[PDB]
Amino acid sequence: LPVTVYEMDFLADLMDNSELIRNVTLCGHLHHGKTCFVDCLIEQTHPEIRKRYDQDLCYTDILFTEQERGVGIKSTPVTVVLPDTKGKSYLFNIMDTPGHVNFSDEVTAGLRISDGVVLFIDAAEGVMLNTERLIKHAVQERLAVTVCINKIDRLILELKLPPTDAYYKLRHIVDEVNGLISMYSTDENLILSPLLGNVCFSSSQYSICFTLGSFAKIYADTFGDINYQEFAKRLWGDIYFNPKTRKFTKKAPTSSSQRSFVEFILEPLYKILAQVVGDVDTSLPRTLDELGIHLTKEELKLNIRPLLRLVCKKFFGEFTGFVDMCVQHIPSPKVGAKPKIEHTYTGGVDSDLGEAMSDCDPDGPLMCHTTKMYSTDDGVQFHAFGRVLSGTIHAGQPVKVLGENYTLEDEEDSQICTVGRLWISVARYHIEVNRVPAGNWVLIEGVDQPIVKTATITEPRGNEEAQIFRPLKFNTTSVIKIAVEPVNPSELPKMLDGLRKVNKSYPSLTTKVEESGEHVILGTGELYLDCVMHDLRKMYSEIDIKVADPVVTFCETVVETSSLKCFAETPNKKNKITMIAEPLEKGLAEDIENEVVQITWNRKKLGEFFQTKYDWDLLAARSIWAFGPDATGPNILVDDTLPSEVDKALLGSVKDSIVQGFQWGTREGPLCDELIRNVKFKILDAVVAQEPLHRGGGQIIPTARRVVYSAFLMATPRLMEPYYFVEVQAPADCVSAVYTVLARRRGHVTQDAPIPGSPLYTIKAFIPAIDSFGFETDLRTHTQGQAFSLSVFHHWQIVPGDPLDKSIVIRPLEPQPAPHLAREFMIKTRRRKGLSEDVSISK
Amino acid sequence: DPEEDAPVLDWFYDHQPLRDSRKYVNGSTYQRWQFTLPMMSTLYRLANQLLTDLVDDNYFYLFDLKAFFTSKALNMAIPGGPKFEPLVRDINLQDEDWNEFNDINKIIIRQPIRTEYKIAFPYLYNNLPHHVHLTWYHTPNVVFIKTEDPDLPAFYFDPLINPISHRHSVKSQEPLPDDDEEFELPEFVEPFLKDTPLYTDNTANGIALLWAPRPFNLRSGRTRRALDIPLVKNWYREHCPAGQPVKVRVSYQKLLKYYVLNALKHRPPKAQKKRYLFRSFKATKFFQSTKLDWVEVGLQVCRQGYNMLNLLIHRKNLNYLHLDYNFNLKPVKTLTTKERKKSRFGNAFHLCREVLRLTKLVVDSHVQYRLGNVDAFQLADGLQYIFAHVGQLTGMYRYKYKLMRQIRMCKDLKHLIYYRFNTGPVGKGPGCGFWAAGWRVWLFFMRGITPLLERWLGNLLARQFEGRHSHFD
Amino acid sequence: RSEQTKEIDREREQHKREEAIQNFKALLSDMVRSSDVSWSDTRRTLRKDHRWESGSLLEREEKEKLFNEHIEALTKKKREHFRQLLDETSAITLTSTWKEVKKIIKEDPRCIKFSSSDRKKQREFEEYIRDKYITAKADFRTLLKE
RNA sequence: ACUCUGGUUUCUCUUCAGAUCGCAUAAAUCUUUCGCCUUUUACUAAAGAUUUCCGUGGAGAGGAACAACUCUGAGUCUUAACCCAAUUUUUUGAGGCCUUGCUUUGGCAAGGCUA
RNA sequence: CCUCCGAACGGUAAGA
Predict the structure, then answer these.
(1) Contact A38/A385 with Cβ under 8 angstroms?
(2) How far is A534 from chain B (nearest CA, A)?
């Protein structure tokens, strides 16, 4: 164990008291100083760990890929003890999460086991793509949001804004974030302002971090007889300071006075930085003496940036303002366990475990939720990582691990495992402990084998009522699709083993085996899949693996009503299922996928919604049978049977088979074996005879599949490819190059706007996901490395052309024109699936 | 300028500036230095011709050392990057034939997979990516703004910075029923640095020095040997300009190739005992110490080398041979075949002869400068010509042909400098005197040749004085 | 900055114009499927769709020119289909009659797309046969030149 | 606001050298391959391992030289103008008595008298 | 557009 400030046994004592614990996830955009902030925290807690005078420490960048690339790839936990303004120690469980958008899933894996989200914003950049995405995700996960504005030195040493303009920039950042939260929420208690203590201003490179409370406490310590809580309620906004009355007035004393925040906080910071970086030899000792800072002779000989860091560490001291923010605005596990169970527990808060866990009882029934899987040093075994929502997990205690498929009716997906050693992760050394009480974060060994991605650990034979926690909902969709083979086919087994391990390391990774024996990996972007394949080649499998050129996963839709009442007759030739297919209204699929409307609703509310906004027949709205291919699937199966033709009792005994067959038929797809998206199936004529033996599930489900395909194929089917949303932060002269690059890739620019308070421009555009391969590299090359872009899956858009136009010739090495694209994309997909070339209506 | 350049004016062109001043250097041994910010700013401004306008490493995307290592390990060359030989030869890259996994009719092509992609993400776009290096992904764009006017305040809202939008303030505090006295600070309470000004005249310069190339972002440091400063290393580390001829482009690529090879083959120096040659020599009674003009000691070295080779010749009784003072072996008369075979020296004698010829040329250019025949600008041009035309002035390439590698380099640098020099009002013709580039190359050549030549000449001189220093069946 | 915004805005305008052109081309390729339909007749009939306002940055001249180009391309596709179907029957040669072709290509959808009546169809078949005879003459000249 | 401590340069030597010894970059040897090839060198260019050379840092030792003197560290790092103060210390009226009950006396607890 | 221009030896009549 490396030497720290606090006792390790004191940390274990802090473990028991759930009130003295905060579960905090540090999220934000790419390279907004999240890892450097944790570096500063580690330096504050660990005396013997210090940042190099030239290179960043990157304590939580523990993967070699992370160290070389410079981008955080996987979330890393640090459990530290931090003092607040009052000096009371707290146990902070911090999730240093990647800022790259392709690893948004990783952030989600930390947002499940976290009560509060500290969102880092670059002061020079502002609100970016991943910032907005994570605001939406954290609010919709019902988490307490606290914003922290990192890299405020860039406003001083790099942008050189006047302090009033720096205040305006910070105010703009805060107001924009508040607007974002208000857009995606209903509460008025989710408003952010440093007046309330929701915002810290920091520069993690120079170890600056302060709220208004901490700076007011610095003033109180240097002067005395100052209520720093009452003083910090006035260091923000248009409140000015009259020195005649020694008062704070909302009106301007003079005609050219400054804000209180500028006078008392920003201006001293500017002067500190200016005296350190410009007058280090002339007026620096006098300035430091005025601040009560004494540096040695060997410390004044340092370079300007190490000296700035040292000076700001002597002045500000410790990150007590950050701890104040996370204590006063992020609920403790005991306080915050009720909404967490309300949101992420299948049984809800109304069960006998929805209240035994909502109290966060350290000595109740053991219920832990593991959502991360961290590799061992060699890379053979794994350690699950998760939050102990109830009970006290012990080392050696056997537990019942429940997978995502465990339900009460079907209990096949469970296993009794032996908990090996338990660790507390501080991201580079694991404190091995004997037990972990509730409300904490724990590393568990031995239980990894039955865990695929997320698991619920409970007591064996303890709670037969114990359900599973809801599986992780990811912000984006795995779209990019690579195919992998072993170089030596005899080594195909080993690759499979490797393909399992990565499947545990990456929460959004979607590995599978297709019909033709292909091993297909689904990821979110080029960097995501590059890291996946680095880990699959170097870390786990340690073999030679060939990659295919990446493609995207298509979907299938309709554009017109099916010309014929497409009918299917069962093999017994007594049931006649006659349906049509037509597209849903614009945006209805978005409502279905976002859980705006749910199948769990009563028919009353569902019909009320579908009559309110979509103008249907209430008979048809009440008759909406199923959402496909899943409960959230953006496909609708509307029953359009007449009341006087097919009796409800005659049809209710066969509705279930029709529903399941429709679900799996839309899951498969008849064009190129892809999900059918945005389709409405009106069951017109369901001739079901009398005998219950002739209308069984094996009699209907394949017939349901057949009628679904027949209705689909006659409704002018079309291919739909995913479209990514791209934000480019480019200099003003490199916008024409961005336009030229996006022109070559079928991409159109939604907007190009200058960034307020920065010389840069933001170009927001839409680009086809199949055309976005190497788009970032091309954009950075064509703009001399200046235009940087992040790509995220946004929506689905119809591929140009008719997929079934069999009069289209395809030359195998030429980018086809748009009207042929849908014909091309289907055929080469089918050949990859191992299917027939032409789609025939006769099946 | 006595006003602008005051911090450096009185010591700028001294041989070893500030050596006597203990405020700046440790002492006469000249190991450490510690300057002030105004001096650093003046030096940085005076050197702004040999430095880069880049404040960020983002310019070197797919053009840094890691990208080059990856491209070398993949037998691929980025546009403007160096070409190498393949690492893995005995695995044929076209031996992979049309199987069902690489089926052309199975893959969709809309945008060709350029070699830039295969190096940005080597594990995704390449099969068998052995010995590939992951390039640094991205550094946040430095938005530092260089100001070319000291009259501007160190802090000011630059017109380049885009303006910020209008007002918004949601502060719904309780409307106080005002019969009260509100918050008041103590009497002696004031902002932390009310006395100090917001910005002085050295603040903007220090901020600019933050975003400055090494060593101008330094405050102190260690002295380096004059040959260890390449001074043009960042010129071929950037992309070649647009309308350059083919020779200049290939010169950039070859300089880049040798930079990559030096960075890749670099091994840490080995631990060893501190052997010093000249300290041992001075410890004897046969060596004295003095302080001589460099031109004088150069003439002494030239004369000593001539005398020493001439003694080597006259020892073997070769009166028909004549070593001239430009170090040219000459036949006095038409020599018989028996005389020609007895006048056949090894590559040791001829390599020493040609090295002494180059030294004689350099020292003789300096002597021509000191005699007043040739002035300083033409002296620098002559040295630049000498160090870039060793293949023609001397002939050591025919006794150690590997040094042709140096010659090509000295030509490559000649291009790199010339097309940075002969731009604008400056055309072709002589005049460039930036001889540091080739001088470094020939010094580093001598660094490796010194042990080889010393061994060869030791063997030869020991031989002059009767000294030396189907298997299995 | 004035130069900079002038440069940015002109390319923004060009991008919007070309995107509108591509959208109109997609509308033309998705709806119009017969070369016998008039350009302005469809323009007065296809304006009742949803994306018919995609030409908000276009005039009647550009739309009519694009419709003419699409009609020409469709006619070329139909003619190519007719020529390809004319390469299957053995009776089609350099000296075939149109009266016999009216039964050889009686139920010919490619030829029907080429021409509804026998006059234009006979003219097109005669032009194709003349091209085939020219190709045979070229083959004879190539053989006799050696 | 004070008492005890106490340097810098330069030369040489002996060792340890991870570290961008070196923000620079040479050569040789060996083993694999590579291009020529007509005999040796001299070569072409990639990998690995060795050395050699131009340099470097740390520690210790011995000298010569502004060495005779600060600075740094440690140490509690000394006091009278204007305040005798009305919630956790050393100027705060809180002070006592008896009854009752318990307890072996002693001692303990609730109540009253209170200027 | 193409600019990389190498070298030495394997060339001794043997005698008077």
Answers:
(1) no
(2) 6
